[PDB]
Amino acid sequence: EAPHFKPGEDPRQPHQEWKLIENMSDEFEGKKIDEKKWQISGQGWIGRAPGLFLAENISLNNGSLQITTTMLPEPIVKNNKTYTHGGGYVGSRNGMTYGYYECEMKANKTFMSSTFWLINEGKDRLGCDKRTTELDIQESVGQITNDADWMKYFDQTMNSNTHSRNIPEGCEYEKGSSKGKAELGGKAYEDFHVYGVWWKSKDEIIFFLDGKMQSKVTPPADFDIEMYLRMVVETYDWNPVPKDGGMTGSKEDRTTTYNWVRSWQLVD
């Protein structure tokens, strides 16, 4: 009935309350994902090669969303690139501006990502709102395959980010990124964690982990454009495929599991 906040961490003021945004929230009960609420195929982004988003890799079980990584049984060529692995994409068909957005997620234990984020959809927007604003709440991988120093702990942190890019010429916005990082206390695939963001205003973004405030970030440009939820399991170029193909794990180890996604507005 309220967001997950430990005692002493709820940022609301005493005459305010948190209200569930029903069309951006799901406990994932039942046997099949609700495709009137969520888009899992037909989306603009098919996947970063070599990981192709498959609708078949999305399942529900036991009141949770499961996005499972796979080896494709044969390569698939799309946009002149070869795909060899299956990930998955789940995007909210409804958007909002501002609010509190949280999920409870356990990452997969593979070289592919486990993510929870917001982005606007600039080509449907007008004038300067065609610029991109992306708010990454958590991005993780389960198996680090690049020995670059910047990423050696990427599998045991909350890695949050805010991006401004694709800005139309003449529009007075800056491009760039403002990151946040915090310790999970364990690997992202070992336990569930609650990853949350208070998208408080166009210039105040506050990240929470397991019900505790971690950081406040000023984004690189105003975040005052409607944004849509994303839960995505992909390949990143900087975390390449391991020598065994990276898909020998159990179904559980190949699965990013979200127990729920809850989105809220703060009202007077």
What CATH number should be reported for the domain holding residue 243?
A: 2.60.120.200
> Which residue shows structure tokens 């994932």?
28
8-state DSSP, 168: P
Burial of 268 per CB tally in 10 Å (0-12, 13-18, 19+): exposed
CA Rg value for the chain: 18
Give the closest residue to 246 by CA, choosing from 145, 148, 156, 146.
Answer: 145
Q: Give CA–CA dist 7/9, Å, rounded.
A: 6
- Selecting among 56, 139, 183, 252, the annotated active-site residue is 139
Q: Give CA–CA dist 90/258, Å, rounded.
A: 11
DSSP bridge partners of 255: 68
Rounded to an integer, what is the distance from CA 252 to the centroid of its chain? 19
Check the CA dihedral 57-54-231-163 and report its sign: positive
The answer to whether 102 and 3 have CB atoms below 8 angstroms apart is: yes
> 3-class DSSP state for residue 256?
strand
- Selecting among 9, 134, 226, 234, the annotated active-site residue is 134
The answer to whether 256 and 19 have CB atoms below 8 angstroms apart is: no
Residue 35 vs residues 4, 41, 182, 262: alpha-carbon distances, Å: 26, 9, 33, 17
For residue 82, what are its two tokens? 């070869």
Give the closest residue to 159 by CA, choosing from 136, 134, 133.
Answer: 136
Largest Cα–Cα distance in the chain? 58
For residue 223, what are its two tokens? 């975040």
**End-to-end C-alpha distance for the chain, whole angstroms:** 17
Residue 228 vs residues 8, 96, 137, 164, 174: alpha-carbon distances, Å: 29, 7, 13, 15, 22
Any catalytic annotation for residue 172?
Answer: no
Q: Give CA–CA dist 3/1, Å, rounded.
A: 7
How many residues appear in the chain? 268
Any catalytic annotation for residue 104?
Answer: no
> 3-class DSSP state for residue 57?
helix
> 3-class DSSP state for residue 213?
strand
The amino acid present at 67, given as its one-letter code, is: I
Give the closest residue to 160 by CA, choosing from 175, 173, 143, 177.
Answer: 177
* The total number of structural domains that make up the chain: 1
Q: CB-based contacts of 177: which residues, under 8 Å, 6+ apart? A: 161, 162, 163, 164, 220
Q: Give CA–CA dist 119/40, Å, rounded.
A: 16
Full residue range of the structural domain in which residue 3 is found = 1-268
Q: Give CA–CA dist 255/75, Å, rounded.
A: 21
Q: CB-based contacts of 144: which residues, under 8 Å, 6+ apart? A: 111, 151, 152, 154, 155, 239
What is the structure's resolution, reported in angstroms to one decimal?
1.8
> 3-class DSSP state for residue 24?
helix
Strands 51-53 and 81-92: parallel
DSSP codes of every residue in 182-209:
EE-SS-TTTS-EEEEEEEEETTEEEEEE
The answer to whether 207 and 184 have CB atoms below 8 angstroms apart is: no
